[PDB]
Structures are given as C-alpha cells and as structure tokens.
Curated annotation (Swiss-Prot), chain A:
It is found in: Virion; Host nucleus; Host cytoplasm. The gene is pol. Residues 1-146 form the Integrase catalytic domain. The chain holds residues 868 to 1056 of 1143 of the full protein. It comes from Human spumaretrovirus. It comes from the Viruses. This is Integrase. Mg(2+) 3 binds at D7, D69.
Amino acid sequence: RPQKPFDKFFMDYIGPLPPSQGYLYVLVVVDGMTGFTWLYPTKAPSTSATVKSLNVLTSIAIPRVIHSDQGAAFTSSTFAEWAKERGIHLEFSTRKNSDMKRLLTKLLVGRPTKWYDLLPVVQLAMNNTYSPVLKYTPHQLLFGIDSNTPFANQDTLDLTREEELSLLQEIRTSLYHP
Amino acid sequence: RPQKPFDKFFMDYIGPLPPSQGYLYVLVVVDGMTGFTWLYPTKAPSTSATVKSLNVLTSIAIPRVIHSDQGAAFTSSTFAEWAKERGIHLEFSERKNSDMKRLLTKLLVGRPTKWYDLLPVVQLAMNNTYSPVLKYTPHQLLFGIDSNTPFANQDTLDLTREEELSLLQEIRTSLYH
C-alpha cells in the first residue's frame, strides 16, 4: 500500500524512559517501503515536539500518508492543520510495531543514564541489520543495494567503543527472531 | 578528496535571523561527496544545539571528518570531546560554501515571519535541483542515481502554496548562477 520510499510513515512514541540529559521519550518513525527507522528523542509526547521532528524528516520528503496511535500528540487540532497544509493525509488504528517498540524500550531502559547518547547507534544498528522478511537491510533499501556504504567494516559498522558493540551484537541477534 | 557520502561534513551556522516560531539560527550541514544539505533550525549558535542536530544526523552514519570555521560552537573543549569519543577528526582552516550561505540568508531574511515553516521546502529544493558541477541533484548522489524520486513532479516538487513556488523558482534561478 505504500508505493515508494518516504510515501507512508509509521509513527508512535515510546517510554516514558529514565531521564537521559532531560530526554524521556523517543518518537519512532518507520518508512513503510524499506522499513527504515528514524529515532527522534523528545522531552514530551507532544504535538509541538512531533511537528519539530517531522519538520526535519520531511525536509527530505513529504509523505502522502501518516499512520499512528491515538496518543494525544497525534489527534490534536494543531496537528491536523499541520498535515492539511503539508498535504499529508492522516490515519489511525488501535502488530509488527509491537515487537520492535518493546525490544527498543528494553534496550534504552537498560542504559538508563546514557540512552540518549546511544540512540544514534541504536538507529544505525537496526537500519543496518538483515531483515529476513525484506532479504536486505533497511539502509540498503533506502540508499541503494549496491551503493558504497558509509562503513568500512560492515561486520562492526565502524563501532569501536565496547558498550556500543554490546548493543550491536544484541540488536542483530534479537531484532527479528526473538 | 572524499570517497563516500558521510566521510566529510562542512559545517556553519547562519544568523541571527528575524525570529519566527522561537528560532533564530540555522545550522547548515553539507556532505563533502554529494553536496547534500541538512538545515537544522536552532535557537542559538551554541555547541549544545550542534550536538543535538548532529545526533539526529549521525544516526544515519558517523562522519569521519568535519570541516568548520573556528566559531565558538565548534571550538569548545566539550565539542572537541563529543567528536573525540566517536572518532571524528575536526578540521579547522572554500568560496563555494560561502556563496550558498549568503544565497540562503537572503532567502530566509526575505520572509522574516515565514522562513522557519519554509525551511523544509528550502532544503527540499536545494537537494533536488540539478547541479552543473555534479551533473546530478544531490538527492540522487546520497540516495542513488536510480533512487526513487522524493516527489511526483520535477517542476513543482509537489508544492502548491505561494511562497513555496516563489522559493523554488528563486532557488532554481540563482543557486548555480
């Protein structure tokens, strides 16, 4: 039903999480086509924060549809006026999101103080992990299967810090087959 | 000298600008290889905000080197420690990245009340305009020459509003001329 990359996004908040540099929530945005995940950390599951993050993301491309939960952030009057102006169509429903979000929450809660700093590494690892459904990584599907990737050591994603490898090894093993 | 996208970034703020939606500055980040541009709307030309925007950015990948002017944001000892930790070399010192800053400022200043909401449109038009030097748009260079196009129409870029279509024409008229 999504036609190309950046055509349909799947959107929800996770947390609340332990405070990490004043951050408590993560807006998770998954591309329908490629499965590419954008992790935007926020201080509030709000519309204002949501419009901030999406203004960054939609700098790349404006979707035709957005799918979400019924959280207050997404049902708001100001959010609809934002969509209708951007041209975007809205959609609500309350599956595969469940497993992914739950795994992500376990990971970020397991790094109570640091999780904000390790966020980028989390997003990188999940996007560069073989999905047995897609037969490629979501990064490969977004940037080109044969493209020269920004990583030399594909095995290690150019990660050197021992706590960041611990993250990678764990994500690869448990992301799709629990 | 760049081999891949995400090898080298060129960084610099633009501002202060007339304040809309609370924001005063815009961190402009440009990719060495592809010329792809990320504009980040900010409150201050601070280190704090550079880190914030770069954490979103470096989610996609760690850049190996970052080129920047010796502005306060980039020269603080903590931004030196923030880059150190994840193995990024900082490059303190060329006309072509300043020719675009001035080209950008005048587009933003031009709509003193509107610019922040048009920021995403500004970027969308920059990364999706054919470059003479490159022979391709920078979106094509980051995502693939054969990458899916981030729009339905090459002329409009799926844009309808008055300022958008004004911007797009200005951006297409003046970028490389």
